[PDB]
Design a binder for this molecule. Structure first.
Ligand SMILES: Nc1ncnc2c1ncn2[C@@H]1O[C@H](COP(=O)(O)OP(=O)(O)O)[C@@H](O)[C@H]1O
Lengths: 481, 187
C-alpha cells in the first residue's frame, strides 16, 4: 500500500507538466503543499506562467475552486472576500480551495490583517459567527521584494516555500514552448489520478505521524546553529523550522517511505532564503551539509586521516630495523661527492622517516619528503637543501649534513641529531580499521541508492551527491595499496 | 474583472459563470501608465500596441477633410461578411500552422539580442507566445501554410511599450529583417 502511493504521485505531476516547460520544480513543489496544507511563494518578472500554476493545481482535486485577483494599492476587502449585505461570499476566498493573489506587496492594512487569520486559524470573520475555510493551497506571486522594516514582512515570514521563477534558457525547450497547442484552460488530468475529498482529510493525519530519526535531527540542529554564527546569514525563526517539517514529512510519505529521509533536506533551499543576498548563502550552506554530513561524507574524511596518521606512527616506531646507508664514489673532485642508492629507491617525491622527533619551525614532524632531483645536487655539489614538513607546506630549509657512518643528520635550533631512515616494504591493525571504514561507505551509498527517486528533488542536485560519495571511496582505496 | 475576460474569457455573474464571445478588444488613451502601478498588468497582456497620430500627407488630407462617407453606415457588403461558423473553424486552423526551422533561428536571435542591451525593453514569455498566434494567422489569411520570415515585421508594434522603446524596437528588427531574414548578412 505505501509503495503504490509513489506511483500515483509521480503520474499525477506528469500530466500537470503538459504545456509548461522548465517548470518541473515549480509544479512538484506546489503539489506537495496542496496536499499538506502549506503555502508557496513565487518571485520573478511578470510573464513566466505564474498564474497558470494556480489554475492547474485545482484540477488535481474533485471539488476545487480557483480565485485569481490582483492586489492593488486601493483594494478593498469587499472585492476580495465578497461584499456584505451577511456577507455575499459566493465564490471568493472563504469557500475556495486554491486562491491566487498577484503582487501582495502593495495591499491595504485591512486585507493583510484578515489574510493572517486564514492561515493559522483557517477561519474568517463573517460578521457574527465564524466559518472554516477549506483552503488547500495558497500561492502568492509578485515581482519585487518588500521593505525590511514594513508591515508586509508578517506574510512573508509565514510563507514556507519561496521559489524564484525566471524565463526559459534552453534553446530546445523554447521551440516546443513557443509552439504549444495544449489549451491552458482545459483539463489535462485524467479522472483516475484525481484525488477525492476523503483522501485529502486522511493524508493530513498520516503526515504528522512520520517518525523523526535521530540522524535527521543532528542535521537540522547543525544547520540552524551554523546560520546563527554568520552575520550575513538570514535569521530562521521557530515558525519556519516547525513548518518545514510538515513539508519534509509529506515528501517521504508520498514517495513510499515511513520515516524522514536525509535526502529531504534539499527542499530547504527554497524556504530559508528571503532576498537576493540570502539566495547565494542558503544554497551554499545546504550544499556543504548535503555533501558532507548528510551521508557521512565529511565524517569519514576525518576518520580516514586518523588511519593514515596511525600508519605513519607505526612506521616511524619500527625505524630502528632499516637504516640509511649512503654509498661513496671515486673520481677526481675537490669536494666529497656522495651517491644515493640505485634501484633501491626510484621515486621522485619519496618520503624519509626519522627516529627521535624534533621541533622544526615551531612544530612537530614525523616524516620529511625529499625530492630526487634536488638530493643528487646536494650530495655532490653541496650547498643548501630544502624540504617540506609532514608532506605539506612549502619546501623549508633544513640543517641536513652527512655523518661519520654514512647517514643523514637533521639538526634544529638546539643542535639535536636525528638519523633519517626510509620506510620498508600493511600491518594488521591498519587493515582492520580500513576494512571497517570501507564497510560504512558501502552502507551509506546503499541508502542513497534507495531514496534518490523522490519526485520533489531536482535533477541537477543528484550529480553532486554521487560525485561527493565517490571522492570518499576513492581516497580510502589509495591507502590500501 | 477585465483580466479574467481575456485569459478565461468568462465573467463572474453572481453565482454561475458564463462565457464571453469577445472577438476583439481595443483600448485607446493618450498618456502612458506608471512604471510601478497596478495598471501594468493589462498593458503586458495587450499584444498589438499601435501609436496612431495625425495625418501628414497633403494629398491624403484633402480627400479626408471633404469625405461624404457616413461613419455610422454599413460600407461592407453582405458577401464579404464572415459568419459565426467560419470564426470558430479558423481558430482551430491557426494553431495548426507549422513552424519552420529557419523562423525559429530568427526569433531566438532577436530575443537574445534584447537581453544584452540595457536600454532594450524586457520581453516576457507571454509576449513571445501570444505573438505566434498573430504571426501564424497572418500567413493563413494570405494563402500560406507555414510561418513566413516576412511576418517578423509585425513585432515592431508589440515589443515596444513607451517612447524610449519605440526607437530601439524598430531599429533592432530592421537590422534582422535586412540581415538575417533573407540571408543578407549571412552571405
Ligand atoms: N515558462 C513557460 N513555459 C510554458 N508556458 C509558459 C511559460 N511562461 C508563460 N507561458 C504561457 O503563457 C501564458 C500566459 O502566461 P501568464 O499568465 O501571462 O504568465 P504570468 O502569470 O507569469 O504573467 C500561459 O497560458 C502559459 O501557458
Amino acid at each position: 500500500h505505501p509503495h503504490l502511493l509513489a506511483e500515483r504521485i509521480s503520474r499525477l505531476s506528469s500530466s500537470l507538466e503538459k504545456g509548461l516547460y522548465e517548470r518541473s520544480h515549480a509544479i512538484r513543489l506546489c503539489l506537495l503543499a496542496a496536499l499538506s496544507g502549506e503555502s508557496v511563494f513565487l518571485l520573478g518578472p511578470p510573464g513566466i506562467a505564474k498564474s497558470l500554476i494556480a489554475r492547474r493545481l485545482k484540477f488535481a482535486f474533485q471539488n476545487a475552486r480557483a480565485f485569481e485577483y490582483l492586489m492593488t494599492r486601493f483594494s478593498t476587502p469587499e472585492e476580495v472576500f465578497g461584499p456584505l449585505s451577511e456577507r455575499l461570499t459566493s465564490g471568493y476566498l472563504p469557500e475556495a480551495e486554491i486562491v491566487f493573489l498577484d503582487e501582495i506587496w502593495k495591499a491595504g492594512p485591512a486585507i493583510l490583517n484578515t489574510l493572517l487569520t486564514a492561515i493559522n486559524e483557517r477561519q474568517f470573520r463573517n460578521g457574527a459567527h465564524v466559518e472554516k475555510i477549506p483552503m488547500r493551497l495558497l500561492v502568492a506571486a509578485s515581482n519585487e521584494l518588500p521593505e525590511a522594516d514594513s508591515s508586509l514582512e508578517a506574510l512573508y515570514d509565514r510563507m514556507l516555500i519561496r521559489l524564484w521563477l525566471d524565463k526559459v534558457q534552453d534553446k530546445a525547450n523554447f521551440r516546443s514552448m513557443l509552439t504549444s497547442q495544449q489549451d491552458e484552460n482545459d483539463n489535462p488530468v485524467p479522472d483516475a489520478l484525481q484525488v477525492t475529498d476523503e483522501e485529502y482529510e486522511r493524508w493530513q493525519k498520516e503526515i504528522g505521524e512520520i517518525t523523526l530519526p535521530d540522524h535527521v535531527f543532528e542535521l537540522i540542529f547543525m544547520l540552524r546553529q551554523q546560520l546563527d554564527k554568520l552575520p550575513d546569514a538570514p535569521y530562521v525563526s521557530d515558525r519556519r523550522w516547525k513548518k518545514a517539517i510538515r513539508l519534509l514529512q509529506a515528501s517521504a510519505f508520498f514517495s513510499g517511505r515511513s520515516a524522514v529521509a536525509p535526502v529531504d533536506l534539499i527542499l530547504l533551499k527554497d524556504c530559508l532564503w528571503y532576498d537576493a543576498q540570502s539566495l547565494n548563502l542558503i544554497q551554499q550552506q545546504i550544499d556543504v551539509l548535503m555533501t558532507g554530513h548528510a551521508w557521512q561524507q565529511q565524517g569519514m574524511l576525518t576518520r580516514l586521516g586518523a588511519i593514515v596518521q596511525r600508519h605513519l606512527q607505526l612506521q616511524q616506531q619500527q625505524s630502528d630495523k632499516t637504516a640509511l646507508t649512503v654509498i661513496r664514489l671515486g673520481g677526481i673532485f675537490s669536494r666529497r661527492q656522495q651517491y644515493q642508492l640505485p634501484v633501491n629507491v626510484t621515486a621522485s617525491t619519496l618520503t624519509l622517516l626519522l627516529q627521535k622527533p624534533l621541533k622544526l619551525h615551531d612544530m612537530e614532524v614525523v616524516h620529511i619528503s625529499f625530492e630526487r632531483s634536488a638530493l643528487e645536487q646536494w650530495l655532490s655539489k653541496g650547498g643548501e637543501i630544502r624540504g617540506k614538513l609532514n608532506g605539506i607546506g612549502f619546501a623549508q630549509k633544513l640543517n641536513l649534513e652527512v655523518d661519520s657512518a654514512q647517514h643523514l643528520v637533521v639538526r634544529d635550533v638546539s643542535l639535536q641529531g636525528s638519523t633519517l631512515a626510509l620506510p620498508g616494504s600493511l600491518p594488521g591493525e591498519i587493515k582492520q580499521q580500513l576494512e571497517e571504514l570501507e564497510s560504512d561507505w558501502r552502507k551509506q551509498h546503499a541508502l542513497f541508492s534507495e531514496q534518490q527517486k523522490c519526485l520533489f528533488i531536482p535533477g541537477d542536485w543528484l550529480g553532486r551527491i554521487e560525485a561527493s560519495l565517490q571522492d570518499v571511496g576513492a581516497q580510502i582505496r589509495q591507502a590500501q595499496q
